[PDB]
């Protein structure tokens, strides 16, 4: 197959209609505006291709066969690598001054007319909390179908060691924290009463249910317990790669926000602020619980931590 | 106009035919291979858009009106910025293992079938020593090196009747090397004195070779030099008097032409590594602006540079 | 000179005291925390070395000799290059998980104890609106001495073409805008309800530029930084940027805005890193002037006025 | 603890003696030369801190307890991230023209830490520096430690899984039917070349000879073990070790890219280097996935140690 025919360059390298040239006088810098956005859209299609493939492995129960954990993590890492290059790609728009942009600004749509469908589809597919025709039907499917957060949440609920009749991680953890706080108290007094309130709040299921309703939490109480199990026992073979998956989900969340930030700055630069946009807020949250390592429940001769499934 | 309609996404986002899926079983990683190369081709079109516009300013004599020097420099810098991102874009291909590449390798063309027309057009347009007609035009038309060469020959201060830069420079170097040789012979018999006499005879041969027009003409014929002797003299004038207003922006242009040359080679290197990584297993000749690198490596001391009287061309533009 | 002796590696490569190891159990990741911040501090010293040198060229009147404009622009570009690498340097902190950071968090100072003097000195020296002793004296000097904004402001007031008796840029500009809006209004008067509404909005924007009293009030509210004459001079360089005399000064204004974007992007990544492990534009006016959508055909024309192509010293 | 006192900034921010300023006239650009190299040396110390800690896990036999595989991989990835930034750090030296460098060149070079790092990875000064350099050359390199560990790879044992025996049988039979398929001009020529490459993998005498000529680094058993991790990378037990091999190759590419940019910078102002050549080599054997010996799910591939 010929290079240009395999790549279908007859479509890609023939889609550059300078609106300034079409509606009057050609403005040289408008070509950079067209190519930079066409390049962003190519990478959004690849990010969607990886995200949808990983979403499928989860929805079709293939994540249960743990031979696929390398594939899932590898593809999630690739999404972060692509996202790192998209943040870098803003350096090319920087080469165009705001004075030169104003020369072709008249031949462009308002801020309303200029909005990406693929980025909206990607945000919905990851699980970011709240176009016509085929675009409107494809957007409806993104909102209807299970988000990556919902699929990861269901998977986190099945985490080994959670079962109260088996390992009973939450029961052991609560007991260890309670007993550790007793011996710590037997001995600063102001900082203890504050520290105790924070650690014990983790076991308040009613508080977590209220925070979920206020949009402050996303994961279910059982998925939150399962994520913490992977956190503490990350060195145990069974949780080594799942820890990398949680790590990657947080990294993707940081990059999604860094891209939205640079894009926002670029709009304010050429034309003249979210904090809760983190889908995996709970994964960041669990990293902040300052439980002393010597209070983490010890690991018994329980074969789950070193035996895999298929 | 709608975002996708202005960007013609109906062509761009509908040009991904996975050959594995077409000829049998779909191989997931093949989509990354298609998009990475399509993304490289989008940036090659933008690099060609900037390069051809700058080439036009030169060929149509607009470079004579110096009000355009900001435009030329700005666009040449943009080419280097885009080139910096294309070297970074290789990090995305790194996410695909050589083992996974082999799964879709059977559904692909040989090393011969896989060759970029736009990169070849770009190399020819910079001046590296229907598709067939467009390639013929790239080789026939004046390269960026040829246009820059002609422009360097018109550099003010070169004229022997006027400033006579080359005559002053040769005189200053000759007299400076004489007093340096004397200083070396004044040193008492030492190990460092014998090393200094040897390093002087080598340093003197390098600096004086700059004034051998017959040697430069011979090296041009052997493919070792690219710029004409007058363009080489003109480039050195911009180098030494870069602080003088008239040469501030032209110095940035020469700087940018060297930067582009370094990036073109770094891209060829990463691409070569990628081929040897997926298929199994730093050239100076590839530098178009070798002479601009060459002039930076002469090392003439600042106090030997001929002095400028402020009753001269260095501050009046055209 | 010996490599390690020239670089004084006996100081640099002997300044790593792991506080976890000192106060009890050594935590491996704490070495990365020490080196990453020591590396940031080396680059802050270099950014201060370039910034102070450029500030000096301005304060000591050397910017008047325009042969130094390449030097000023080159060093300002270098500050942006270094700043671009400091934003990238945050990828190294990313390699340390927040869980591992908590293992050495107990052996560290509060949010008050952890604050950079060099970054504070740099912010003050550019002109952004715990330490004691020699540090407190050096911080007082940063706030007292002329900022890079003040030095650039004074230089912008001297911009050629501003003088009312000479080129009179502001007078010409106001006249041209007023007369251009007259002919545009006439064309419109011939439904076109969106055109008449967009005209009254366009007119309000362009004419606001000539309201000196509004600019003086915005300066007081902290919304503007440059004086009205420095604001006029910056716009002169903007419109006549292609004219040889203003080619390099345009790059300088461009660089001052770029440095401002990078200073904020660094503060952003740093803030995100603190929230990850624990749970402001000085040149606002330069960004502002880029947003005025004046049609290029209304910009006052340049006849045989020798200032645009003759330099000074 | 105060920020500058914890960081010992009294040493770091007071180690800049401009030799131009000391021996006469101060040259502004010389400060950039000092800081850029001091910054490189800070990162070489961190790269050595990570590399030595990983080397210790191997020499200490702690790698046998597979709970440490996350730690080893994580630290090896960190070394590649730091290395990526050192290649980027060359953009700061680019801001200094060769003409300005010549102004301080009269008042003026090989890194001990980079030499120590090259020796510690396994790339084949006087006083305390000479003693520390001797230790780097004497002590077991990261290649030697990885080599010993690769020899213990499960599935290699002929009495057990017998990977090499199965693999040779599968390749031999697959090449027979491929040759037959061809017999029905460029394909016949490319087959004779492809067959020679794949069959050479089972020539232990050829590998032993190439090791002696400096063309190979890993022992035949470590080479067999690396290929086992390559093919069965999806199997849980080999998921993280595959990331380790991947990282060792990535570090090797970055070490070379740094040596390249450094060399270009010296010329601007004035395969043998690959330790893990074998890991690149094994990736280049174009074996079809349907020839890989199948795994019965009554095996070691899912139980850790
Ligand atoms: C067989 C299993 N993959 C078990 C499982 C669930 N969540 C996990 C988290 C980490 C490791 C394993 C799991 C499954 O239930 O899908
Ligand atoms: C008028 C002019 N632009 C002069 C010129 C030519 N080459 C140069 C190099 C540096 C500075 C100026 C020149 C011309 O002759 O085209
Ligand atoms: C001689 C001069 N440099 C003139 C000057 C002032 N501001 C400027 C802006 C752009 C160009 C020139 C100027 C001076 O008075 O400093
Ligand atoms: C118990 C063990 N760590 C097993 C081992 C050795 N080499 C390996 C390679 C990949 C996976 C496992 C191994 C050991 O014997 O070191």
Residue numbers in the entry:
A (entry chain B): 40 to 169, 184 to 240, 253 to 337, 355 to 392
B (entry chain A): 40 to 168, 187 to 338, 355 to 391
C (entry chain D): 40 to 168, 183 to 243, 249 to 337, 359 to 392
D (entry chain C): 40 to 147, 153 to 168, 184 to 243, 251 to 336, 357 to 391
Paper text:
Two steps were essential for successful co-crystallization of apo-TDO. Second, the exosite binder AMT was added to apo-TDO2 because of its stabilizing effect as observed in DSF experiments. An exosite that binds both the substrate Trp and its α-methyl analog AMT has been identified previously in holo-TDO224. AMT led to an improved apo-TDO2 melting curve quality and was therefore included in all apo-TDO2 inhibitor DSF measurements. In the presence of AMT, apo-TDO2 could be crystallized both alone and in complex with the inhibitor Cpd-2.
Tryptophan-2,3-dioxygenase (TDO2) and indoleamine-2,3-dioxygenase (IDO1) are structurally distinct heme enzymes that catalyze the conversion of L-tryptophan to N-formyl-kynurenine, and play important roles in metabolism, inflammation, and tumor immune surveillance. Tryptophan-2,3-dioxygenase (TDO2) and indoleamine-2,3-dioxygenase 1 (IDO1) catalyze the same reaction: the conversion of L-tryptophan (Trp) to N-formyl-kynurenine (NFK). Both enzymes evolved to bind heme for substrate binding and catalysis but are structurally distinct: IDO1 is monomeric, while TDO2 is tetrameric with two independent TDO2 molecules contributing to each of its four active sites. The enzymes can adopt an inactive, heme-free (apo) state or an active, heme-containing (holo) state, with the balance between them varying dynamically according to biological conditions. While apo-TDO2 is catalytically inactive, the term “apo-TDO2 inhibitor” is used to describe compounds that bind to apo-TDO2, compete with heme binding and thus prevent the formation of enzymatically active holo-TDO2.
